[PDB]
Amino acid sequence: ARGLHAARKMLAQRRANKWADKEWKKGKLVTRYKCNPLGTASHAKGLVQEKLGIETKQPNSGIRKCVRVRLLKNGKKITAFVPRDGSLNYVNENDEVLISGFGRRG
Amino acid sequence: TRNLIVNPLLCRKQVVVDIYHQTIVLNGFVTKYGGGKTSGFALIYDTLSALKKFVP
Amino acid sequence: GITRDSRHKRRATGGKKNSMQKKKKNTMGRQPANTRLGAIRVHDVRCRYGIIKRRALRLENGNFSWASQSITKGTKILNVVYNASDNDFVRTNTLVKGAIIEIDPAPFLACISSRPGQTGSVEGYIL
Amino acid sequence: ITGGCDKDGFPMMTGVATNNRVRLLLDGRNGCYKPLRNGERRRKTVRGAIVAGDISVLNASHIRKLFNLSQKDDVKKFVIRREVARSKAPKIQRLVTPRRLQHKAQKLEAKKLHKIAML
Amino acid sequence: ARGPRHHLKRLNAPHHWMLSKLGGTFAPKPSHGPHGMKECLPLILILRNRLNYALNGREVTMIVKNRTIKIDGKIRTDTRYPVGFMDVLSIPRTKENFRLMYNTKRRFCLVPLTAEQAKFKLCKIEKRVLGTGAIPYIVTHDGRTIRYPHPELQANDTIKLNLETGKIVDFVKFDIGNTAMMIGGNGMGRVGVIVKREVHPGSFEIVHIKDAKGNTFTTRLNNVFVIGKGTETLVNLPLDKGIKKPLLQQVNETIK
Amino acid sequence: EQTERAYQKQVFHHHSVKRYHKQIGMGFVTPAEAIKGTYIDKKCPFTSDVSIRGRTLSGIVKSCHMKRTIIVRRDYFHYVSKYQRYEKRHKNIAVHCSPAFRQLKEGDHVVIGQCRPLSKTVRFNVLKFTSRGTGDKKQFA
RNA sequence: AAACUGCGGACGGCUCAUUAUAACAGUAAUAGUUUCUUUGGUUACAAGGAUAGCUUUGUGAAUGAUAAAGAUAAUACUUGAGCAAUUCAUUCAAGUGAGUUAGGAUGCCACGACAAUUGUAGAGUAACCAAUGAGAAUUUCUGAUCUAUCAAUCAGUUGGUAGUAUCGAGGACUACCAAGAUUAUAACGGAUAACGAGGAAUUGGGGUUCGACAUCGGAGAGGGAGCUUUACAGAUGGCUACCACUUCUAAGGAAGGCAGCAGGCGCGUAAAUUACCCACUUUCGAAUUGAAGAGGUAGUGACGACACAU
RNA sequence: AUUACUUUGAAUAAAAUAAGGUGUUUAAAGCAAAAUGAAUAUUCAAGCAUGGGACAAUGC
């Protein structure tokens, strides 16, 4: 559709073809406020219940300390990492913990 | 000094003072950066008849 | 209160409108006063901008006119006979414009040609 | 008798008739209420015409008429002059009262002079 | 907006009022009168900016209410009286008189009026209508309603008005040989001679105006304020003589 | 002409009655059928008390099934800045048709003029019309 | 001082819940309506009662609570004397692109005045014609995000006649007649973390995203609904009824609506003093003077922007 | 014969963007000062008028 009067299809084609964008569709579907525990919120506040050790993937070899946190808004259970070494001693239960993502976007 | 104009209807004169270091009302007295030279805006109402009524 | 806006109507496509604001005074409405046959009784309404409207409730005398002889004298209204809008107005004897009424030409079929609900009086001519 | 308030100082209405103070939209039209705004009809619990137990407490132009004070006498002595330690007659309102050469000079009888309708 | 507004915001005022953007929150809304909202300059602006007599609005009230300023033949005592077109101004206390004329720089200018020449003020007729009782009359550009004028006086002419007597002296027709001062948009502030008129029945009548030096511009008919006949001016023109300089000697001269 | 409940009469009726007719403005001739005809219409631009104000458009008559009112289809092109291309569009306007235009039919170019609101939708009046082809459906006003 | 009377609180300030051709932006119309204020012009030597403020008796815990009595005034309310505009029926007829048009005349019907007005010294009133005012309000043309796991939608609905109501056109409402109106050029329906615009962030060009928020327009005052005053309110720092809250309490009862300015609880990743002054800008008022948590000043403040120490 | 296209205008709120000038000492700023207010350029998409008819659509 290259014609001078053929602007109806080119707008229709671009509208339909934009939904295949894996990232553009993600920010427009109604799931950030539903499926994402954080949502548009930058950080999250919750409570610590259970502490985990997640063994590293196949190329590596170790146990990564982790905790299980239930938020104060959604109430779901999520797993959080320890940013430093020996920080599992400092962490406790039923205390305010801030959770904000990782290097990769969500 | 500077500019001297006389109000023909308000019975006063508007002047611009400049410091080089009861009938006069002094406002706008501020100095330059770091002090020293100071300026202002002196108003003189001569006769008290106009001063007592042309004043906030 | 009665309103005369189109916000409550439907589009030409049948699409029901959606309410954005509540009722406003600029589109007021008032109930009709069906001027019947009875003792002279007129209520003056306070319209917008302070103007006054004469709302006639019951009248008996109208200042009918004759065009073929150029005479305008009052005559007593007998009864409402024919109405172009509703035959049920005849039974109630509502006085509205265009209502064919009969009179006795003591000072001389008449059609009312005024707005008793607005002007406050009945006038007509000779058919 | 006359009117009166209620046990809680609620006026008994000569119009309505109730044994316990009822509430109705009210203004100075029947005296029971003092409108704060313009047309402030308030539903206030005022007593009715019944005198039952709840009622508990049951209770010069015009100066040209103080006593036949006509005008033409120009009387400033007939007008009351109670004295204070000043001799104080209140006033004489719109009339032909003595001065009356501001009234009829141009404000009432120029009038085809201060009312000229001309060509 | 339940009714008419009483406050005028600073930034919503007409741009030709010289008002600053950080001067204040509100601008003085002119009261209703002979001239329009955007066709008038408030009296407070004249005595605070164009004349610099009053430092602020505190002293503006102590001048107008003192019966010191006379607008046209009569005298006004309103702080925000709508002062529009060249209707005269008289301040006998300071022995100075002015006139509210336009200029090419899109503003209101105060030309100096002598005492003798302040007795008259030309007015442009806006419409001619015949009232009840066969009493025809005209309405001018300041809304002034006068009694029986010349029967030849039409709706879009100009008349020579008097102040003390309030009578008519001379009237100039709207023709192909007159001089006009513009009161509208692009051309407003210009003086020129009407050379051609083109009439479109549907929407507007368009005229052509040629300046004294030969510059030609075009404008709408509502904007044509006739100032004289046969290249003659009946009033004192502003400092720049109402001529339009095409920016060629505006930036260059202002450097020196 | 006279077949309804009320007595249908012209808005401006005067004894000679005469056939009232006023002159419309910017260069529109008065139709012949508006003079010798016996019809009575209270909203006709010529023989009634409705004017023709500023806006004036044109279109193709598509519907001729409503009494003294027709629908004109105006087709234009909408320009889209991003794609630098136009697109076909249309709008339907309800215009009151006076009984003067006896030969008016669907598919004929018609010039319409604005006026005060005559109905909930009808606010334009037919001024003149031009004949066109045929499609075996001679649907008139 | 008071109090009666007049004017104002329909301006201003706040918030963005509703809202998908709705509103809004440009544009044209109002020969389809129009006030308030302001401006120009026109049209008996003075009648009468009662009412507050005023004096006296109280109630109850009371609200900006409350009744009787005795009085006392108007530029408060009426009477009273020297054409304008309104309806109908007929007719004569000149600007405007456009009018049985402004306007005049004929005959009854209705309202029918220019305060029975005011300072010794510095104007006001009653209607009407026209400006105001590009104003307000209705309305014309064009223009808006996604969606077909939305393809057919509407019955006052589309058109006509007559009336009704309105300030006014109009299915805005009622009575009678016809079946019509929209739709693949996306009608109808659904979603919004949708108030719209001037604009902002970023861009070689093209574009993408944001816009509650300085200014303009729209809407609302916890939720609808109905009304009073008047020139403008369907007002809510007005009232009335219900729904949901909240306060004092003498237990009988009373009013209140911080999406105004400070401040509190909760919500949260998320956001400041329970300060002073109308002296700057402007508004209202009986008007040079009174008021303004508008506005200005003062305090916190690493949201940011500019200059600059070791 | 319209329309589209194209060229000129008319009129079009400010603030904001680009800026014309101006030693807030520079700069951010402000329209101030030592009479000037930028002509300030607009304004996507529509609407009015006009010069042209090559490329285009509408039926004769």
Which chains share 3+ C-beta pairs under 8 angstroms with F? Answer: A, C, E
Which residues does chain B have within 8 Å of residue E93's beta carbon, measured at their own beta carbons?
8-9
φ and ψ of C90, to 5 deg = -65, -45
* Mutation choice for C interface testing from F4, F7, F69 by most C CBs within 10 A: F7
First-last CA distance in chain E: 51
Encoding tokens for residue E86?
């060249």
- Cβ of D51 near strand G (under 7 Å)? The reply is no
Q: In a 3-state reduction of DSSP, which class is residue E16?
A: helix
Residue E132 sits at the vertex; the CA angle it makes with E128 and E135, to the nearest 5 degrees, is: 55
Chain A interface, Cβ < 8 Å to F: 3-8, 10-11
φ and ψ of F25, to 5 deg = -90, -105
Encoding tokens for residue E43?
């009296």
CA distances from D74 to A42, C20, D79, D100, F81 (A): 92, 71, 10, 10, 92
Q: In a 3-state reduction of DSSP, which class is residue E221?
A: helix
| Nearest nucleotide, CA F132 to C1' | H59
Element (H, E) at A25: helix A22-26
Task: Tell me the three-class secondary structure of chain C, residue by residue.
Answer: CCCCCCCCCECCCCCECCCCCCCCHHHCCCCCCCEEECCCEEEEEECHHHCEEEEEEEECEEECEECCCCEECCEECCEEEECCCCCHHHHHCCECCCCEEECCCCCCCEEECCCCCCCCCCEEEEC
Q: Which of D6, D48, D44 is nearest to D28 (CA)?
A: D44
In angstroms, the CA E111 to CA E233 distance is 14
Q: Which residues pair with A54 in a beta bridge?
A: A64
Encoding tokens for residue A37?
């525990």
Closest residue on chain F to A11 (Cα): F83
DSSP classification of residue E143 = -
In angstroms, the CA D77 to CA D62 distance is 17
Which residues does chain E have within 8 Å of residue B56's beta carbon, measured at their own beta carbons?
58
Place of tokens 């001799």: D87
In angstroms, the CA D32 to CA D12 distance is 8
Q: How far does C118 lie from chain F, in Å, by closest CA?
A: 21
Q: In a 3-state reduction of DSSP, which class is residue E136?
A: strand
DSSP assignment of chain B equals ---EEEETTTTEEEE-EEE----EEEEEEEE-TTSS-EEEEEEE--SHHHHTTS--
Encoding tokens for residue A73?
């808004």
Q: How many CB atoms lie within 10 A of CB E250?
A: 10
Strands C52-59 and C41-46: antiparallel
Encoding tokens for residue F25?
């403005």
φ and ψ of C86, to 5 deg = -135, 130
φ and ψ of C53, to 5 deg = -115, 135
Q: At CB < 8 A and 24+ separation, what contacts does A55-63 make?
A: none
Q: Which spans in chain E are helix H?
A: 43-45, 57-64, 251-255
Q: In this complex, do F120 and C9 lie within 8 Å of one another by their Cβ atoms?
A: yes
CB-based contact, B5 to chain E, within 8 Å: no
Which residues does chain A have within 8 Å of residue F76's beta carbon, measured at their own beta carbons?
none
Q: Which residues of F106-127 are buried (b: 16+ CB within 10 A; e: fewer)?
A: bbbebbbbebeebeeebbbbbb
Encoding tokens for residue B8?
């023909």
8 Å CB contact between D73 and D105: no
The set of residues, in sequence order, having a beta carbon less than 8 Å from that of E204 and lying 6+ positions away, is E220, E221
φ and ψ of E49, to 5 deg = -115, -50
Which residues does chain F have within 8 Å of residue E204's beta carbon, measured at their own beta carbons?
none
In angstroms, the CA D57 to CA C41 distance is 44
Task: Residue window 15-74, chain F: list those with CB within 8 Å of chain E.
Answer: 25-27, 54, 56
In angstroms, the CA E12 to CA D66 distance is 62
- Cβ of F137 near strand G (under 7 Å)? The reply is no
Q: Which residues of E12-32 are buried (b: 16+ CB within 10 A; e: fewer)?
A: ebeeebebeeeeeeebbbbee
Q: In a 3-state reduction of DSSP, which class is residue E64?
A: helix
Encoding tokens for residue C75?
């005559």
Task: Residue window 121-140, chain F: list those with CB within 8 Å of chain E.
Answer: none
In angstroms, the CA E35 to CA C123 distance is 45
In whole angstroms, H3 C1' to C51 CA is 51
Alpha carbons within 13 angstroms on the beta-carbon side of residue F26 total: 14
Element (H, E) at A23: helix A22-26
Q: Which of D116, D65, D60, D66 is nearest to D92 (CA)?
A: D60
In angstroms, the CA F125 to CA F44 distance is 8
- Cβ of D38 near strand G (under 7 Å)? The reply is yes
In whole angstroms, G42 C1' to E158 CA is 24
The set of residues, in sequence order, having a beta carbon less than 8 Å from that of C15 and lying 6+ positions away, is none
Tell me the torsion sign for CA atoms C87, C90, C95, C99. positive
Nucleotides of H under 7 A from a protein CB: 2, 4-5, 9-16, 20-22, 25, 30-32, 35-40, 44-49, 59-60
Encoding tokens for residue C113?
């040609």
* Residue E208: alpha-carbon gap to chain centroid: 21
- Where chain D is discontinuous (C–N > 2.5 Å), the residues before each break are 59, 85
Q: Which of C105, C113, C91, C115 is nearest to C33 (CA)?
A: C115
Q: Which of E182, E199, E200 is nearest to E191 (CA)?
A: E182
Q: How far does F138 lie from chain E, in Å, by closest CA?
A: 35
The set of residues, in sequence order, having a beta carbon less than 8 Å from that of F111 and lying 6+ positions away, is F56, F57, F58, F126, F127, F128, F129
In whole angstroms, G79 C1' to B45 CA is 60
* Residue F45: alpha-carbon gap to chain centroid: 9
In angstroms, the CA C28 to CA C46 distance is 13
In which region does residue E125 sit, left (phi positive, over 0), alpha (psi from -120 to 50) or beta (all else)? beta
In angstroms, the CA F28 to CA F111 distance is 10
In angstroms, the CA E23 to CA E27 distance is 9
Q: In this complex, do F120 and C98 lie within 8 Å of one another by their Cβ atoms?
A: no
Amino acid identity for residue B16 in this structure: V
Helix count and strand count (H, E) for chain E = 3, 17
Q: In this complex, do C98 and F6 lie within 8 Å of one another by their Cβ atoms?
A: yes
Encoding tokens for residue E78?
């309103």
Q: In this complex, do B10 and E93 lie within 8 Å of one another by their Cβ atoms?
A: no
Amino acid identity for residue E172 in this structure: V
CB-based contact, F81 to chain A, within 8 Å: no
Burial of A80 (0-12, 13-18, 19+ CB in 10 A): buried
* Mutation choice for B interface testing from E47, E51, E53 by most B CBs within 10 A: E53
Q: In this complex, do F54 and E203 lie within 8 Å of one another by their Cβ atoms?
A: yes
8 Å CB contact between E171 and E151: no
Q: Which of A52, A106, A56 is nearest to A77 (CA)?
A: A52
Which residues does chain F have within 8 Å of residue A8's beta carbon, measured at their own beta carbons?
87-88
Element (H, E) at A10: helix A8-17
Encoding tokens for residue A20?
């295949």
In angstroms, the CA A91 to CA A48 distance is 9
φ and ψ of C73, to 5 deg = -125, 145
Burial of E247 (0-12, 13-18, 19+ CB in 10 A): exposed
In angstroms, the CA E113 to CA E96 distance is 8
Which 10-69 positions of F have CB less than 7 A from strand G? Answer: 12-15, 18, 20, 22-26, 41-43, 49-55, 57, 63, 65-69
Q: In this complex, do B56 and E68 lie within 8 Å of one another by their Cβ atoms?
A: no
CB-based contact, B55 to chain E, within 8 Å: no
Q: Which residues pair with F71 in a beta bridge?
A: F63, F94
In angstroms, the CA F106 to CA F127 distance is 16
First-last CA distance in chain C: 39
Sheet holding A97-99, edge to edge: A77-81, A63-71, A44-55, A97-99
Alpha carbons within 13 angstroms on the beta-carbon side of residue A29 total: 13
8 Å CB contact between E26 and E9: yes
* Rg of the Cα atoms in chain E: 19
Chains A and E in direct contact, meaning 3 or more beta-carbon pairs closer than 8 angstroms = no
8 Å CB contact between D42 and D26: yes
Which residues does chain B have within 8 Å of residue E62's beta carbon, measured at their own beta carbons?
54
Encoding tokens for residue B35?
């002090």
Which residues does chain A have within 8 Å of residue F80's beta carbon, measured at their own beta carbons?
7, 11
Q: What is the resolution of this structure in A?
A: 3.1
Sheet holding E224-229, edge to edge: E216-220, E205-210, E191-199, E178-182, E224-229
Which 106-165 positions of E have CB less than 7 A from strand G? Answer: 127-134, 139, 142-147, 155
The set of residues, in sequence order, having a beta carbon less than 8 Å from that of C26 and lying 6+ positions away, is none
* Rg of the Cα atoms in chain D: 25
